[model samples]
Target: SHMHRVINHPYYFPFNGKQAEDYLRSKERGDFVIRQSSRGDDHLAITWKLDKDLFQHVDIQEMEKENPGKVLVVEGQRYHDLDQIIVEYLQNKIRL
Candidate 1:
């Protein structure tokens, strides 16, 4: 089976289980949790509040890497190129 993964490492904010549950009820922007399974499997869950009465949940799992038949595009630019641009922007903004 194919699995999903977040291309960019998502930022996780501190929150307890109760706080997370409570936030989901009101559904405010930027309220979310990125969690991994306790079983140590290659599984991840991202739960976020989209709006009042709207919540988004994403579950990711591992999958084998394969070749792409063709390059992908976003807004007329190549995906790989866009990634490099974002990487450069972050590198300039962050010191490591």
Candidate 2:
């Protein structure tokens, strides 16, 4: 729980809504993808797809169903704002 808050903290990114949208849009397609939760307003999810075949043959939904807690799948429209998005990628690359 403590770690969760730390990761979600605004200080980590420090970008506003507009800045976040611009930053995300600047990236090339297929470089990353976003997901959000309809059930929770504060829930925003982001996944970095470094490999083209990451989800090719794998069934993410099926995997989540088979191992409930083991896999989590949050379905929602693509997120453009990084204000609430949890970036699961290489943060070291960025000077921030």
Candidate 3:
């Protein structure tokens, strides 16, 4: 595989939950950020404004194998070139 390029994402933050909130404080609901998890380098956390105020954090695991065609977060075979979790919620305005 080449690379996931997840680390280079514009919304990817090197900070933690609270600090991320500092960044999201001014952002509107539906706005979100992906951050490096304290757990490990391979691990990542998703933070987003779930409602009119406050934020929610969800830890997601990068798939064990990265295919040349597409990367799978965890689930059905039907996948996309771009990370779907972000697309799923980011586009639908839903959070987990």
Residues 1-96 of candidate 3: C-alpha lDDT, one tens digit per residue: 413567776667887888888888888787878776777544667788766558888765555545534343423443333366668658846533
Write the residue-wise lDDT of candidate 1 on 1-96 in tens digits: 011223343433233444555656864454556444433243444455656656555443433336752232323344332234345334533442
Q: Which candidate model has the greater lDDT, 2 or 3? A: 3
Better of 1 and 3 by TM-score: 3
Query: How close is each model in CA RMSD to the real structure?
Result: 10.1, 10.8, 4.1
**What TM-score against the true fold does each predicted structure earn?**
0.35, 0.27, 0.68
Candidate 1 regions off by >4 Å?
1-10, 13-19, 23-27, 38-42, 64-96
Instruction: Tell me the whole-model lDDT of each prediction, alpha carbons only.
Output: 0.43, 0.35, 0.66
Poorest 10 consecutive residues by lDDT, candidate 3 = 73-82
lDDT of 2 by residue, 11-38 (tens): 3333333343444565533343333323
Descending-lDDT candidate ranking: 3, 1, 2
lDDT of 3 at 73: 48
Candidate 3 C-alpha RMSD relative to the actual structure: 4.1
Looking at candidate 1, the ten consecutive residues that score lowest on lDDT are 1-10
